[PDB]
C-alpha cells in the first residue's frame, strides 16, 4: 500500500547530500503494458551520481527517481502485459527508480530471467556495456592487447574476460593485491595494482609496442597513460571516467592538449560509449550473458557489501553507503544492494 523509496531532492553529486529516503510513499500502480516489480537486489552504478547530479537532463528539476537496474518478482501486472508475463515470475530490468521497493516497468523493456539471483542483476548494465562496447567498436581478434581500467570493478570484470574469450592478451589495472589474485583468477594476463607498480613504466617496458585495445572507466592520469600506451591503430574506448564523477563538473583533468597530434601520429582514435545509444544490440547481448552466466563460463562476481564496515548493504538506506564504497574504491564485482 505504502513504501520506501530514494528521492533526488537537491541536484548534487554528493549522493548524500543529493538524495532522500522518502517512507510514506503510495505504491505505483502498473498500467495496462506494464509491471509492477517487487525490488529483491538493486545495482549500484558509479553514474548514479551523475544521475543525481541532473546531468542526464540539466532541464529537470528535483523530485525524481534514482536508480538504474533492479531484479525481483512481479507482484502484479497490467493486462496486456500478462499475455507475457505472470505474477510471481522472475525478472530483472534496466529503467529508471529502481532505488524503491517496488518499480513500475513497461513490460516491453524487461528481461525474464531464470531466478532472482543478484548474478543475473550484474549483467544488465555492467556486462551488457562490456559486451557491446567491445563486440561494436572494439575489434577483437586473437593476439589483440587490451588494457582494462578498474578492472576489478562491476563492469570490468566482464571485459576482461570477454576479451580473454576474443583470445585477447589482457592487461588489467586495480588498487589492491587482493583485486589483482581476483584479476588473475579470471585469466589475466597482467594484473597490475596500480597503487603499488607503475602503470606507465609497466607498459612502457613491458609492452613498448602499445595496446591494441583500451577499455577506459577512469579518466584523468590513466586515460593519459593509455593514450599513451596506444599501438599503431589502437583504439581507446572512453566508457567512463569515474575519477571526475565527484567534482562539481563532473569531469577529470586530462593532458590533452596534445591528443590530436598523439592520435594523428599512430593513426589511433578515441571512441566515446554510451550504452543508451545501443539499444538495437541490447536484447541480443543479455541473451548470451544469460547463457554463459547461467551455465558457468562467466563469472559474475557480487559484491553485496559482506566485508564492508557496517556489513552486507541490506535494505534502502545501505545504498548511501554503498556509493561511498565504490567511490572508496573498495569493491571486487558489482555492487549490489539488497532488499529483504
Ligand atoms: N558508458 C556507459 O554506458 C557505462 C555503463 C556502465 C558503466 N560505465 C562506467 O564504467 C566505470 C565503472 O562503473 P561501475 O559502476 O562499474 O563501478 P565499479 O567499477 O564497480 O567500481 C568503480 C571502481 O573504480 C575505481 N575507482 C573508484 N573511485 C575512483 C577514483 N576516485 N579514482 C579512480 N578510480 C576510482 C575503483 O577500482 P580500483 O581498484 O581499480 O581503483 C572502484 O572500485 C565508470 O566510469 C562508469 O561510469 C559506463
Ligand atoms: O546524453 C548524456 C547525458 C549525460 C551523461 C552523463 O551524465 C554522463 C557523464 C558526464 C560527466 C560529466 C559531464 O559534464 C557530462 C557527462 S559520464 C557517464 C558515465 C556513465 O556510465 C553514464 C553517464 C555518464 C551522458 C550522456
Ligand atoms: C567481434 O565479434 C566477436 C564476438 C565474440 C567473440 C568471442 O570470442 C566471445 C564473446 C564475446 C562477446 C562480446 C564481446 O564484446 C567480446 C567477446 S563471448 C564468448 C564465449 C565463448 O565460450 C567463446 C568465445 C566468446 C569475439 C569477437
Do not use: W
Not at 543529493?18 to 510514506?24: N, W
Not at 572494439?138 to 578498474?150: N, P, R
Not at 589483482?180 to 617496458?205: H, W
Amino acid at each position: 500500500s505504502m513504501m520506501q523509496k530514494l528521492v533526488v531532492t537537491r541536484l548534487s553529486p554528493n549522493f548524500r547530500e543529493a538524495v532522500t529516503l522518502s517512507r510514506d510513499c503510495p505504491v505505483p500502480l502498473p498500467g495496462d503494458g506494464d509491471l509492477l516489480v517487487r525490488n529483491r537486489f538493486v545495482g549500484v552504478n558509479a553514474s548514479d551520481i551523475n544521475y543525481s547530479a541532473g546531468r542526464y537532463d540539466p532541464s529537470v528539476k528535483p523530485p525524481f527517481d534514482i536508480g538504474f537496474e533492479g531484479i525481483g518478482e512481479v507482484v502484479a501486472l497490467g493486462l496486456s502485459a500478462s499475455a507475457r508475463y505472470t505474477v510471481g515470475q522472475a525478472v530483472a530490468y534496466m529503467a529508471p527508480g529502481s532505488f524503491a521497493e517496488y518499480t513500475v516497468v513497461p513490460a516491453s523493456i524487461a528481461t525474464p530471467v531464470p531466478s532472482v539471483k543478484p548474478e543475473y542483476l550484474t549483467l544488465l548494465v555492467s556486462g551488457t556495456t562490456a559486451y557491446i562496447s567491445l563486440k561494436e567498436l572494439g575489434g577483437l581478434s586473437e593476439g589483440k592487447k587490451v588494457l582494462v581500467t578498474a578492472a576489478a570493478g562491476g563492469t570490468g570484470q566482464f571485459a576482461m574476460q570477454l576479451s580473454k574469450k576474443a583470445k585477447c592478451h589482457v592487461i588489467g589495472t586495480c588498487s589492491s593485491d587482493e583485486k589483482s589474485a581476483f584479476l588473475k583468477s579470471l585469466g589475466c594476463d597482467r594484473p597490475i595494482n596500480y597503487k603499488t607498480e607503475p602503470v606507465g613504466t609497466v607498459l612502457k617496458q613491458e609492452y613498448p609496442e602499445g595496446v591494441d585495445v583500451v577499455y577506459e572507466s577512469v579518466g584523468g592520469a590513466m586515460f593519459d597513460l593509455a593514450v599513451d600506451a596506444l599501438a599503431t591503430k589502437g583504439r581507446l574506448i572512453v566508457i567512463g571516467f569515474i575519477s571526475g564523477y565527484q567534482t562539481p563538473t563532473g569531469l577529470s583533468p586530462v593532458k590533452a592538449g596534445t591528443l590530436p597530434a598523439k592520435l594523428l601520429k599512430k593513426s589511433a582514435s578515441v571512441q566515446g560509449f554510451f550504452l543508451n545509444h545501443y539499444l538495437s544490440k541490447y536484447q541480443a547481448a543479455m541473451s548470451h550473458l544469460l547463457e554463459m552466466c547461467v551455465s558457468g563460463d562467466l563469472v559474475c562476481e557480487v559484491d553485496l557489501g559482506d566485508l564492508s564496515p557496517e556489513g552486507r548493504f541490506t535494505g534502502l538506506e545501505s545504498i548511501f553507503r554503498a556509493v561511498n564504497y565504490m567511490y572508496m574504491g573498495k569493491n571486487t564485482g558489482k555492487i549490489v544492494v539488497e532488499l529483504p
